[PDB]
């Protein structure tokens, strides 16, 4: 099996999904590592009668016990919103955090996959590269920004305006991470379909703003952890799959391509024994799509600037 | 496709439990109720590409759509371990809040299996045995207790012992759900093996006191959650392949039994298409087991009386 760490394993998110790494027979070693109550989740997840084996790690001082000998890095680390946040003083100390988990990784295990789940991802994950950059460790093809969770909402909305069991649908989505970032791309759905006008535009916008769906059922005091967690894991397990030599491994991230004028976008990608295997090209996109896609590229291009700037600086 | 609800599935059992649920492939639909926060859980939960069609349910007057339908009713619901508050015994708020959604059940769904977790279940099961009784509803057939984390904690314990996958051992738990009561058939461990006096000791002691292990772990403020989430969906999974009609489906359960004088016990059970299709006795048992059995009687008779006591008197 392989070797696992989640940094941030004790909150919202990280919690549900280390309780899912556990279970996963692919991992062989499981690292909770936080800043806080690492302890409390190690012990209530040790009880879990499952193959892999947890260890909990906390504060900075314990982060390279935590990393070292990692094959695969889940990164939900991140502080919450709270005291009526958006603040963008909230970017500055998730931006930070991602900083810091990722000298340690450049530092402790250079050569592990990484998934950061971080937000906003459309920013972190350039920011995780500059870091590796400046470490000397970049490799494009082992850091993954989690976009997972939108793939998951396209194949559950899909399913329901089809009448289709969510498991049977697959929906491409690419671009980004945020808002009108999030470009489903209804035209290339498995099983074969074809949409209304009707149909494309509420789904689109139903997928760009799931998120908010989750924050208004909850008073707007927190968001979607739940099928976070299972979307990071089932992300996850894609990875491992890959790692372990698994053919066609092939799911939607948001990395490091060459795809569009952009140095980091969202697409298929094929995950094998050293990460990424391959990065699919967007192909052919009718005209609401190329509309969405324009306008997802102009919103991506100063997030991705904004997090590159927060390092190189 | 089999429908579920979870009663009390905004806590920290709940959240988690629910989200497994949601991953089951026989739940065809899942129900989560609780007194807050339901709504938010459930648009989180309803965005995962899963079979189960999931909608929630907030406050008393929404408990009965809740229920109606049910074939399985998953109950962690009750207050936490409060930090400050020593113990003013929570039994008198968790019996209050387990006899209410027991009369709820035994009017919107007689006929559906039951799986009580709240704590704790020594009495709340006999609490909610008195509640059906009186309603009319009663089946021992379709009342059990979910003992499975303590079994759980013994396959992994056991297995750490013998230096074994948690997964490859199977540790038969009888008794009751608190200290002594919880008695571990060591004699009885698959793979067949052979104890020390020490580890017999240990094993025993640290099975007894697996809960009060996490909750020292978590520094006073909360206990087992994740943990608990999953051997209840393990359980709950059990009862599931038992409604599809899978043979062999058993399990150990704190259920009505005439294994002892005592009229609730936690024995294996065979789980059928209406519940419990039978009772197993408890087998071999050496002296140190036949002792511990004794004890476990001893404090087990009182547990269920003060909790038949809350409902007669």
Redesign the interface.
Known sequence: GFKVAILGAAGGIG??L??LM??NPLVSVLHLYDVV?A?????????????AVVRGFLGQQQLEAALTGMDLIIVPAGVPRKPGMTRDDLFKINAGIVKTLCEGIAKCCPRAIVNLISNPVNSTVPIAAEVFKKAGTYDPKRLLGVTM?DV??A??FV?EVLGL???D?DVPVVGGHAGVTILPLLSQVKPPSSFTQEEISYLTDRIQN?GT??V????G??S????M??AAVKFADACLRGLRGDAGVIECAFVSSQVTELPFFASKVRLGRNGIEEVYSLGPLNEYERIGLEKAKKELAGSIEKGVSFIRS
Chains 1, 2 share one sequence.
């Open positions: 919690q549900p280390a309780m556990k279970m109550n302890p409390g989740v190690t012990a209530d997840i040790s009880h879990m009668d499952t193959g969770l998951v909402r194949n559950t399913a069991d969510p498991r649908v799931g769906e989750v208004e059922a909850k008073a005091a927190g979607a952890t739940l099928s967690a299972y």
